[PDB]
């Protein structure tokens, strides 16, 4: 099938330039125009511009004329976006999308690349188990930078009763928590464990929830 694979999250310092990629597969690359969109947390979709990979023609929303440069490489079936003169206002999720011949509809989208433009240093999380009919257990992931972290329980086995809350930034560090609810018969008779990944610091930590 058609697929659009965007590059992973990026943290850059202010003033820098960054180049995101959008790797297409499952179709003839040069036949379709590719668009880019900006979306800031909890806000609408802002069109950036497009690249026609067949002739490398481009057009931009005025807002990004100075800011964004779109390119494509026919060999690698990859569209690129270069953002320049970065500031914190450019921190956002960036999406690529393919425009279809069928009514100019955008039927296929990349998963999104999250950009953080920050001066703060990369820092791994400290993971703390929260131990105390159903039982709710917890996992505190404190003092990391940048986003994202990935939390799971029993490697996804307990996905059902889980709430992983959005990270909150304080003093240039993020903190979040995750709750899991299970039957009081299952715990502590069987082991529950939160798994936390912080790719930016190459961190994979497991903490078993043990009664006090």
């Amino acid at each position: 099938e058609v697929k659009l694979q965007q590059s992973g999250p990026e943290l850059v310092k202010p003033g820098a330039s960054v180049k995101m990629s959008c790797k297409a597969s499952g179709y003839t690359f040069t036949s379709y125009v590719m668009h880019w969109v900006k979306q800031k947390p909890g806000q609408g979709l802002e069109w950036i511009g497009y690249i026609n990979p067949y002739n490398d023609d481009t057009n931009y929303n005025e807002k990004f004329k100075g800011k964004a440069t779109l390119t494509s490489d026919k060999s690698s079936s990859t569209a690129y976006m270069e953002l320049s003169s970065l500031t914190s206002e450019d921190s956002a999720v960036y999406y690529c999308a393919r425009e279809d011949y069928y009514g100019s509809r955008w039927g296929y989208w990349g998963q999104g690349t999250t950009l953080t433009v920050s001066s703060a240093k990369t820092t791994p999380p400290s993971v703390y188990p929260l131990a105390p009919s159903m039982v709710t257990l917890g996992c505190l992931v404190k003092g990391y930078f940048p986003e994202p972290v990935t939390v799971t329980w029993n490697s996804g086995s307990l996905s059902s009763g889980v709430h992983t809350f959005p990270a909150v930034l304080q003093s240039d560090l993020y903190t979040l928590s995750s709750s899991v609810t299970v039957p009081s018969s299952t715990w502590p008779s069987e082991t529950v464990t939160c798994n936390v990944a912080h790719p930016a610091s190459s961190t994979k930590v497991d903490k078993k929830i043990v009664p006090r």
Binding site: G44, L45, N61, A97, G103, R105, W106, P129, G138, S179
Partner: protein
């Protein structure tokens, strides 16, 4: 120069009701033949998804509960019957000249009022021995979204070092959840005996409170 005005910005509907979302344009988007209006659905942490193309064509793989209509200057997206999974933001879109997205409509589900299930956690031993102390309070699966959390130590309100975080509306049951964390130093924590988080919510007249005594274990 075609301006898209989408309305309403917010819509709350009961399970089974009809939702209707409108998008109008300053000029006709249908003068050359087909109507260049598309509709998208976006859920938190996901890219937008195409629902309807060219005003009224249902995209492959999307359910018949969704339908589009209109022509020229006025367009609607109808969802009927509305399901719990439809909690999302919906966008209209036009290209032709300057590609433009509507401002979006956030669809929220209505449901029965529900008190939070409140659970409170003392700092883990691992944290205390690194010199810190976070007291965590979960307030889970409640409705409606508005809720007040208060922290008390030895029977009196504290406000410093409190961080709150809220989830989006649940896909399955349409409830909301919240965490509140009170952070102090290890030394500060060990100077007090009683810790309390209390929720003021629309369901009860009295607040829901959970507490613990540091010196239990």
């Amino acid at each position: 120069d075609i301006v898209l005005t989408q309305s309403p910005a917010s819509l709350a509907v009961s399970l089974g009701q009809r939702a209707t979302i409108s998008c109008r344009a300053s000029k006709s988007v249908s003068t050359s033949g087909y109507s260049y209006m598309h509709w998208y659905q976006q859920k938190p942490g996901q890219p937008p998804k195409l629902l309807i193309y060219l005003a009224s064509n249902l995209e492959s793989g999307v359910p018949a509960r969704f339908s589009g209509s209109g022509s020229g200057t006025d367009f609607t997206l109808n969802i009927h019957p509305v399901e719990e999974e439809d909690a999302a933001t919906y966008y209209c879109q036009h290209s032709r000249e300057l590609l433009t997205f509507g401002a979006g409509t956030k669809l929220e589900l209505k449901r029965a009022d529900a008190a939070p299930t409140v659970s409170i956690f003392p700092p883990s031993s691992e944290q205390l021995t690194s010199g810190g102390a976070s007291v965590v309070c979960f307030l889970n699966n409640f409705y409606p979204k508005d809720i007040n959390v208060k922290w008390k130590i030895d029977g009196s309100e504290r406000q410093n070092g409190v961080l709150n975080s809220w989830t989006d509306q649940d896909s399955k049951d349409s409830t909301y959840s919240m965490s509140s964390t009170l952070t102090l130093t290890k030394d500060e924590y060990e100077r007090h005996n009683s810790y309390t988080c209390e929720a003021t919510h629309k369901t009860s007249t009295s607040p829901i409170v959970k507490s613990f005594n540091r010196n239990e274990c």
